[PDB]
Symmetry: C4
Subunit: 165 residues, 4 copies
């Protein structure tokens, strides 16, 4: 669905990992660390978004190594991991590029994402985000976490800039 | 749907792993041992529950270091792995904290869980639990095993205590 | 649903692996070999069946150690792997135990299973089996392949024998 | 068949991997490399098609040895990998066998597949292909990417050849 926001002023998109770029339910590695998922259609749009000049960030509380490598390989340079207080890292990201809050989209799925979602210009969440998160979101994707909700908003922003084709 | 029970009486929540906190269908590791899944929304609620003073136990026949690690990383201290007859680990958990049965929730999915479910105050099960288990459950989650039925009940109990942050 | 057959007469149950006890869509191991999935509810019933004196076989074109190890661990001794022409292995299984066709259930999902299904007394298939297989099946499980169709039929047969609870 | 095309004309089927023969959402290997999925019903039909003399190609931007070995093991002899320019793989595949466009089916799921789909005779896509891909597809499978959309078209073509 189209987002209730002037997407033309979005210059940056930030994402939670678990329940957003990765599925909420994932296999467990023998090591005890979650084996995350990535969505290939998410991937296409994200690498394109980086090529077209949008600042992309991931902000996660874990040390999700495999996710770091994958998105690094997509050109994403702002990878905030072990983010115990996400709002502090969001601020770092915003200020690093001299952005205003109204220029940043953030997509989260669970309560540790709420503080950022309250400060960012365009809070978004997947179709299966928790109710507390849906109530703070300006847009709720048609797609569940890990299954194309990233592709959804990235494609919308790129199209609105005429940078999709 | 709220659980038909006075959740303020619940001081402890115990979970089967396979089919409850981990999906019923899982990848088979090349070793021939099943690879459990974890749900990150479950995880958030579980770790918060521990912090808020709810007692949390997992009780599983499984012996994999992955499951032990993952739950110990959430602050679960009562990890009953390699469980042969679950009722004993249930009693152990109950008695360790001076609980009565009516103060304990147990969530199971299959026949080996029935004995504990008959004894605990608040038996539940996921949406896709087996008939005999649904039969004895006071509450059936809206979520399938591994897909957030853990999150469901932990949150409900935390909310009823005024501890849902 | 329930099987339209006199299950008290069934003395043995044989299963294809891929697409029946394992999902049709599976992760690809880096070695180039498809991984398999297993279902924990299938497992409980299968190990129970062996304990209740029912003859259990798997008949698969696959050859992976993981599959062999997993089913052996459930106590399954009739492991027909690398099965190129399944009818030979079905007949070997039947004649091994002096069974007649009407005493054997076989569950398959694809064309290579059809010959065995035409011969066994009780051919079954998962909900997502191919239409040619559904055409020869006397029973279609409510469950997709890998997701509990094994449990479905094993449990029905054990209950018929009064060997469930 | 239920595809609106004379499938007996199709002599070759080419498939994108990710989002078509492998699922769109996949597990991540600890190396940071996505782990593809395969569908066992796709597999049976693919190996049969090869046996019945249909030309099969897989066209993918990836380079993983796993996808290489798997499809090789199914008898697939035309494995286009490491590719970025899909139209070139398609044209090379077509010309290798002296085919005309109308004799080739191609199934893709995303924007980079569009150029090929506009050139091939029978462009198909999975049920969850992006909307731009759906608008150029002659046929949209009932199956999601990685979940039997390959089996769908291969089987329909083999049936129309009387080779099923
Ligand atoms: Mg999250
Ligand atoms: Mg269980
Ligand atoms: Mg099969
Ligand atoms: Mg693709």
């Amino acid at each position: 669905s189209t987002i209730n926001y002037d997407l033309s002023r979005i210059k940056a998109l930030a994402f939670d990992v678990d329940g957003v770029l990765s599925s909420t339910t994932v296999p467990l590695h023998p090591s005890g660390e979650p084996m995350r998922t990535v969505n290939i259609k998410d991937g296409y749009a994200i690498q394109l978004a980086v090529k077209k000049g949008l600042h992309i960030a991931i902000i996660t509380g874990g040390r999700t190594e495999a996710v770091r490598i994958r998105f690094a390989a997509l050109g994403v340079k702002d990878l905030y991991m072990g983010s115990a207080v996400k709002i502090h890292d969001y601020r770092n990201f915003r200020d690093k590029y001299g952005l205003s809050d109204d220029e940043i989209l953030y997509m989260g799925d669970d309560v540790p994402d709420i503080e950022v979602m309250r400060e960012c210009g365009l809070p978004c969440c997947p179709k299966d985000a928790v109710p507390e998160v849906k109530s703070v979101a300006k847009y709720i994707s048609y797609a569940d976490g890990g299954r194309g909700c990233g592709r959804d908003v990235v494609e919308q922003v790129l199209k609105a800039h005429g940078k999709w084709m």
